C-alpha cells in the first residue's frame with residue numbers, strides 16, 4: 001500500500017490522498033477543475049474538462065503509470081449537454097484500448113465545479 | 124489486460140470499451156437502455172431497466188463470466204420512485220450470493236435515459 | 247468469494263449483500279444512515295454522517311478488516327453545503343495514510359437520506 005502524491009496535482013487538504021496504490025491497482029481520487037497553483041477553478045467548460053484530465057494525468061504519472069493504464073473512468077457532469085465535449089477532449093488524452101467508463105449528470109459538484117472525474121489504474 | 128466486446132451489447136462508439144478485464148477483475152462500462160440493433164432507447168421504465176440488465180449480461184458473457192460473478196453493481200436513477208421496480212427486476216436476474224451495490228438518484232443520464240448501471244465482475 | 251454480513255450493520259433487504267470479498271479486495275455496499283436496530287434513519291446531518299461511518303465500520307470489521315484498509319471511499323450528498331462536516335467527522339474515523347475519495351452532489355438518496363457512502367477495502 002502506497003500513498004500517491006504529486007505537487008503537479010492539486011494539494012489534498014483533508015482526510016484523503018490523491019491516490020492509493022494497493023498491489024497493482026491504483027485507486028485515484030475524484031479530480032475537480034482546480035488550478036494546482038491557485039487552488040481556484042479554471043473558467044469555461046473546455047478548460048475545466050482539460051484541467052481535470054491534466055490533474056488526473058499528474059497523479060497517474062506520480063503512480064508510475066499513465067492514461068494507458070486506466071481501466072475505468074467515472075465522469076460526473078452538472079450538465080450532460082457537455083458530454084460530447086468530454087468525448088472530444090478525451091481524443092487528446094486517450095487512444096485504444098480505451099477505459100471502461102460510466103457517465104452521469106449530477107445535481108452539483110464540490111466548489112461549484114461543472115465536472116469531476118475519478119479513475120482506476122492497473123499498472 | 125484485455126478489451127471486452129460483445130457483438131450482442133450496444134456498440135461502443137467513442138472513447139471507451141464495453142469492459143476492461145485486468146487479471147480476474149472485469150471493469151464494466153455503465154449501460155443505458157439502448158436496444159443494440161436500433162441504437163435507440165427502449166420505451167418505459169420496466170423495459171429500460173430490463174434492457175440495461177440484458178446489455179450488462181451480454182458484456183458479462185463476453186467477459187467469459189455471468190451475473191453470478193458480479194461483485195458490485197451501481198444503480199443510477201433519475202427518479203428513485205422507480206427503485207421498487209429496479210429491485211424487483213434485479214431479483215429476477217441475480218440469486219444468492221447477491222452482489223454489493225450502491226444506488227443514487229441523479230439529475231440526468233446520457234440520452235435522457237431513466238436508468239444506468241455499471242458493475243465489477245471477478246472471474 | 248465471500249458474503250460479508252454484520253449483524254451490527256443494517257440488514258440487507260433486497261438482491262444485494264452488505265459487502266463481497268473477492269480475493270484480498272472487499273467491495274462494500276453503499277451505507278445510508280439507518281439505525282440497524284430500528285431500521286429508521288437517525289436525524290440531523292452530523293448524526294447521519296456518523297451513522298454511515300459506523301455502518302461501514304461494522305461491515306468492514308465483519309470482512310476481517312478496518313478503516314485502515316479502505317483504499318477508496320465515495321461520498322454522495324444531496325447537499326454539498328454539508329461537505330465540511332463530512333471532512334471533520336471523517337478525520338475522526340481515519341488516519342494517514344488516508345484513502346482516495348470522490349464526492350458528488352446527488353439529486354436524491356434512498357429513503358430520503360442526506361448522505362450515502364460506499365467503499366473498497368483491500369485486506370493486507
Ligand SMILES: OC[C@H]1O[C@@H](O)[C@H](O)[C@@H](O)[C@@H]1O
Nearest residue numbers: 016029030031032110347348
Ligand atoms: O474540494 C476538493 C475536493 O474535490 C474532490 O474532487 C476531491 O476528490 C475531494 O477529496 C476534495 O475534498
Ligand SMILES: OC[C@H]1O[C@@H](O)[C@H](O)[C@@H](O)[C@@H]1O
Nearest residue numbers: 101139152153154155233234
Ligand atoms: O450514450 C452512450 C453512453 O452510455 C454510457 O452508459 C456508456 O457506457 C458510455 O460510455 C456511453 O458514451
Ligand SMILES: OC[C@H]1O[C@@H](O)[C@H](O)[C@@H](O)[C@@H]1O
Nearest residue numbers: 224225262275276277278356
Ligand atoms: O435502503 C437501503 C439501500 O441503501 C443503499 O445504499 C444500499 O446499498 C442499497 O443496496 C439498499 O437498497
